[PDB]
Design an enzyme around this catalytic site. Sequence first.
Site, PDB file in Angstrom:
ATOM      1  N   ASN A   1       1.032  -0.897  -0.333  1.00  0.00           N
ATOM      2  CA  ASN A   1      -0.020  -0.312  -0.306  1.00  0.00           C
ATOM      3  C   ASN A   1       0.560   0.825   0.317  1.00  0.00           C
ATOM      4  OD1 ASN A   1      -2.989   1.406   0.400  1.00  0.00           O
ATOM      5  ND2 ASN A   1      -1.792   1.995   2.080  1.00  0.00           N
TER       6      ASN A   1
ATOM      7  N   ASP B   1      -7.422   6.072  -0.490  1.00  0.00           N
ATOM      8  CA  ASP B   1      -6.406   5.315  -0.631  1.00  0.00           C
ATOM      9  C   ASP B   1      -5.207   5.729  -0.549  1.00  0.00           C
ATOM     10  OD1 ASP B   1      -4.581   5.064  -2.744  1.00  0.00           O
ATOM     11  OD2 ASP B   1      -4.212   6.810  -4.110  1.00  0.00           O
TER      12      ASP B   1
ATOM     13  N   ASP C   1       1.156   4.925  -6.271  1.00  0.00           N
ATOM     14  CA  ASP C   1      -0.359   5.436  -7.193  1.00  0.00           C
ATOM     15  C   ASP C   1      -0.210   4.331  -8.318  1.00  0.00           C
ATOM     16  OD1 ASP C   1      -1.617   6.344  -9.537  1.00  0.00           O
ATOM     17  OD2 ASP C   1      -0.724   8.541  -9.331  1.00  0.00           O
TER      18      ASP C   1
ATOM     19  N   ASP D   1      -1.986  -7.237   2.769  1.00  0.00           N
ATOM     20  CA  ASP D   1      -2.216  -5.483   3.933  1.00  0.00           C
ATOM     21  C   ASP D   1      -3.089  -4.798   3.408  1.00  0.00           C
ATOM     22  OD1 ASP D   1      -1.653  -5.006   6.635  1.00  0.00           O
ATOM     23  OD2 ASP D   1      -0.330  -3.551   5.106  1.00  0.00           O
TER      24      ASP D   1
ATOM     25  N   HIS E   1      -7.142  -0.322   0.870  1.00  0.00           N
ATOM     26  CA  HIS E   1      -6.680   1.197   0.292  1.00  0.00           C
ATOM     27  C   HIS E   1      -6.090   1.107  -1.502  1.00  0.00           C
ATOM     28  CE1 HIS E   1      -7.904   2.282   4.352  1.00  0.00           C
ATOM     29  NE2 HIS E   1      -6.877   1.221   5.307  1.00  0.00           N
TER      30      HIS E   1
ATOM     31  N   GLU F   1      -6.616  -9.288   4.404  1.00  0.00           N
ATOM     32  CA  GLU F   1      -7.498  -7.698   5.148  1.00  0.00           C
ATOM     33  C   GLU F   1      -8.056  -6.311   4.792  1.00  0.00           C
ATOM     34  OE1 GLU F   1      -6.075  -5.059   8.136  1.00  0.00           O
ATOM     35  OE2 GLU F   1      -5.011  -5.151   6.610  1.00  0.00           O
TER      36      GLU F   1
HETATM   37  K     K Z   1      -3.969   3.299  -1.140  1.00  0.00           K
END
Ligand code: K
Length: 480
Positions: A104, A194, A202, A231, A235, A261
């Site tokens: 992420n 996000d 990105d 993980d 997001h 998750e």
């Molecule tokens: K993100």
Amino acid sequence: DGLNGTMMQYYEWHLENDGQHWNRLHDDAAALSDAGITAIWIPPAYKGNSQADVGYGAYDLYDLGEFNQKGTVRTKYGTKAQLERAIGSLKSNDINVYGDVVMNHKMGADFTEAVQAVQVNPTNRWQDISGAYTIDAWTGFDFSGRNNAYSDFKWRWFHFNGVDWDQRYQENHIFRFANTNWNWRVDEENGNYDYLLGSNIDFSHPEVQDELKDWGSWFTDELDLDGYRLDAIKHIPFWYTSDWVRHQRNEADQDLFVVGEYWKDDVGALEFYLDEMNWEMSLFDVPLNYNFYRASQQGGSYDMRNILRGSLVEAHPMHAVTFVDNHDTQPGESLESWVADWFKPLAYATILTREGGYPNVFYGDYYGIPNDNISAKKDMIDELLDARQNYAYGTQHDYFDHWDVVGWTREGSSSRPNSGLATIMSNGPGGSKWMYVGRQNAGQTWTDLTGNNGASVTINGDGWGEFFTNGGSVSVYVNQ
Ligand SMILES: [K+]
Ligand SMILES: [K+]
Ligand SMILES: [K+]
Ligand SMILES: [K+]
């Protein structure tokens, strides 16, 4: 040979930073296999923001405690060689290894870069609340110390789209890089979720897309993984995780189990995500996690008939990884929703002795959490692991027919010796309940594996038996 699967998260948030955890894992392999554990979910095994980092403030995905970066060679858990030694031990003991995967964000950038950014509304990222201006974000990663081993990819601000800290004026804000979009699709809480923390990746950039795909494959081959624990995927752009997953299964010979998750106390949201994934992975049953919490917090007034109501295992038992607590829910952490000692046994029996879901044992409960004076529940869990490993087989019959007392049974299977069990519990005053356990088990005498009740239950001619339980307790009778 048809053995039920039981996963174990081998770490807790307050583990000691003595770099000896990989060695503990190696020495614990046999014992864990013997107890009923079939798969181990290891924490992020790569170099984080610092040595004491639990693994989520991920700095360099290619440094598994092998290079001197961020003030240390090894990670909190140990060296790369000790981790491979551990994994080898787990394999020889027939235990699958799932690696924690954090894609992420990134943290611990080596240097800052000037970047045109705009402040956005924390509770609604779609909305800017400032004009664009130059900030100094920590986005430059050179990985000095790795010497381009395994990969020579370098990260720069243009690979990201946001941060929560400007070093120029030294302030905290949720910054969206100007002329960059938030990823999509992603969870919609706060408008667009996000951005979570650190330097947010990105994924619109093809170069990013390929790097994490290539990294994923390198990681999978280096450790010889059997799956992953994805993980903070709520997001991460949905399309990409899907893409990434498909890519790894394509590159790897071995099967790959994948549990993601998606942290939301909303089964619908989780189902929506599983739709987008084409049900090619399982998700941790977060609503169930909060069901246990609500029941732990509320006490005896909680209607046990609704304990599984709204969970994920209830609706799609084949794509649910059930658990009671983890490193984010333990006391003092970000997603705290800790199930107290009195209810923890009921929760564990519910995920370990039922046929649906893939149950996961939490290291913190198993060995305790010293930091908070939380005792090791090993004794209580081992008995349930024994139930699951040798008795939780065959047709299931449920009895969520009372607000305090509820239970269920498993008739057992011809393939397994004396398998079969009857679980009964109460979160209020005690009681008894007649349940069917299979006419084929008539005449047997079943006793409580947990030892929370001395009652001896003999199965009558029609395959029925009356099972007992005291208040706020759980029992699991079997033909021992
Ligand atoms: K993100
Ligand atoms: K919980
Ligand atoms: K109740
Ligand atoms: K007890």
